[PDB]
Amino acid sequence: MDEILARAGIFQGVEPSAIAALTKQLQPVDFPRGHTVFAEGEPGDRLYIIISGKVKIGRRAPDGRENLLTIMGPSDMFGELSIFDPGPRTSSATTITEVRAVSMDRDALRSWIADRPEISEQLLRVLARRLRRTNNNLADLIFTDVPGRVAKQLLQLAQRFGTQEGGALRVTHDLTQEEIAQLVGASRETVNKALADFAHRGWIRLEGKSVLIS
Amino acid sequence: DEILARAGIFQGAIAALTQPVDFPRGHTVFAEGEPGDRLYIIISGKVKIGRRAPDGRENLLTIMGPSDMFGELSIFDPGPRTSSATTITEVRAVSMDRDALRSWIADRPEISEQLLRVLARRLRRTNNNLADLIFTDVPGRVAKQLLQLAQRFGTQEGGALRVTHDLTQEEIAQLVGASRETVNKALADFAHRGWIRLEGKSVLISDSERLARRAR
Ligand SMILES: Nc1ncnc2c1ncn2[C@@H]1O[C@@H]2COP(=O)(O)O[C@H]2[C@H]1O
Structure with a gap:
């Protein structure tokens, strides 16, 4: 579903036709329940957008348990940061249910903004606005x-x-x-x-x- | 000179196209709430970045020294400063404004890749702190x-x-x-x-x- 995909935050404030230009080039993948999409330490250079299903994001605890960092569902992105700052993954992504998800790597992204400078600027806007929300989110949480x-x-x-x-x-x-x-x-x-x-x-x-x- | 290269923006030379300023101790670069426009990269010295708690108490966020950058949010999401920047010791830094930065981007979209890295990395670190606050x-x-x-x-x-x-x-x-x-x-x-x-x-x-x- 194009609508589900287009609701991703990486498309926030972007022309529907440029979103579509990217979407068409992506084919959905099927992930079984309890499947590890990526583990901590593994090279990370792509982001996922969920169409259906729930995905667990977590890190390793001293005792060996995995801390529930967050839960992403449909239209949600995970691993998106590695598209801008690639490198070893600091967290892990594991499917909680059966998932259908779209993926895209840095090459795709760069090829996408290669012709569309308008998008780099908007990505900065959205990413920077997201940093401000996460900032005072932390602030609120600290004082509790x-x-x-x-x-x-x-x-x-x-x-x-x-x-x-x-x-x-x-x-x-x-x-x-x-x-x-x-x-x-x-x-x-x-x-x-x-x-x-x-x-x-x-x-x-x-x-x-x-x-x-x- | 070698310090500037370690900055996040230039951590990806054509960088030689790079306003130098010297601040004294205890100087307040910018105050929480003021109109936020400028960007800052430290060459020498340390700068405390803080935000007031809901009770008024000054609360420390991050401490930054050489090759570190602060006040970036003001360029991409213009508006009030979300925090205050105070110099712990004598500081030598270089600054830039939204209109000056947007010009260098219009000429070279290459920086957009480095700028996004810096934001994406700040974003990740704030997420790690949130997880630490709860699980550590x-x-x-x-x-x-x-x-x-x-x-x-x-x-x-x-x-x-x-x-x-x-x-x-x-x-x-x-x-x-x-x-x-x-x-x-x-x-x-x-x-x-x-x-x-x-x-x-x-x-x-x-x-x-x-x-x-x-x-x-
Ligand atoms: N869960 C689903 N089951 C059946 N059809 C679907 C489902 N999700 C999307 N589609 C179909 O696939 C189409 C993809 O493009 P649209 O979103 O325009 O319209 C969508 C529906 O017609």
């Missing part, structure tokens, strides 16, 4: 306690993958209890202990297959 | 900060590399984003273990491997 930080992070994920259902956010998933444990990168006991606590304060109503967030 | 403990973060300061301002001195940063133990606490009480406990803990030596504005990192094993 430990639990408050994690809460904020989870809230942002809810706001992104949740449907507005009467002053609340519904996030419907198709994951088994073990997959949810793999997603967070924590014990299955630690997860259920945390979910039990959030529910206790009325922040979470846990129904089968879905979660209702305040 | 206070002592872990403290060690990680010292190790990052050593990469930029570290000179070997006998067995331990002396890392001069000219920062207060409270200013470090701001970099890490934790209470000064918890940060001080972490610093003393490292000192008592023989990992580091506290020298006022300087730190002697005796055991680098331990710190590295404490930051992961």
Whole structure:
């Protein structure tokens, strides 16, 4: 779907015809659930745009667990930074569900802006505006306690993958209890202990297959 | 002269086409909120970049020395300065404005590739800090900060590399984003273990491997 692809942030503020000029040259790839798209340390020089599915972004923790950095879904990009500043990947990307995704490397990008200087300028604008959002995001997070930080992070994920259902956010998933444990990168006991606590304060109503967030 | 080459913009000569200025100690290059237009690359000296917390307290973001660049956001996303830039010590730097930079780009689109690298890299580092803030403990973060300061301002001195940063133990606490009480406990803990030596504005990192094993 061209619309899904065109919603990517790398296309924000770009002429639909220049977006299309790039899109047409890209063929979708099929990734199975639990598939490692790229691991930390591996050379990184391409970005992915998701059409369907969810992808986990994470880094290695001292104990050997993988910290849930973020979760990207449809229209979302991952690995986009390596297109501008390539090199060894500082994070890993792993499919949470079955994914269909589009890829593009630096050559593609350079060949794309090769004829379209207007795009370099807009990319700077979008990237720089994104840095300002991420900056005061950090600022906001710094001046908050430990639990408050994690809460904020989870809230942002809810706001992104949740449907507005009467002053609340519904996030419907198709994951088994073990997959949810793999997603967070924590014990299955630690997860259920945390979910039990959030529910206790009325922040979470846990129904089968879905979660209702305040 | 060789310092300019290490700058992010030129880290990718045709660069010789490169306004030099000298600032004194404690000089405020720009203030948080002022109209933001200029760009700055440091040749010699150190500059504190900070942003006020919601409570008014001045909070330290990053410390930058030679070959480092600050105030770039003002050129691409024009508007108020999001932060304040203060010179810790005497500083010699070169500046540029949006209209001056946009001209060099019109002539050579090659820089657009280097400019994007710099932004994309700042963006990545801010994302790493966000992950550290959540997944890395206070002592872990403290060690990680010292190790990052050593990469930029570290000179070997006998067995331990002396890392001069000219920062207060409270200013470090701001970099890490934790209470000064918890940060001080972490610093003393490292000192008592023989990992580091506290020298006022300087730190002697005796055991680098331990710190590295404490930051992961
Ligand atoms: N999940 C899907 N199932 C079936 N058809 C689809 C799906 N996603 C996209 N398409 C079709 O593929 C087309 C791609 O271009 P359009 O987005 O214009 O319109 C899209 C639909 O016709």
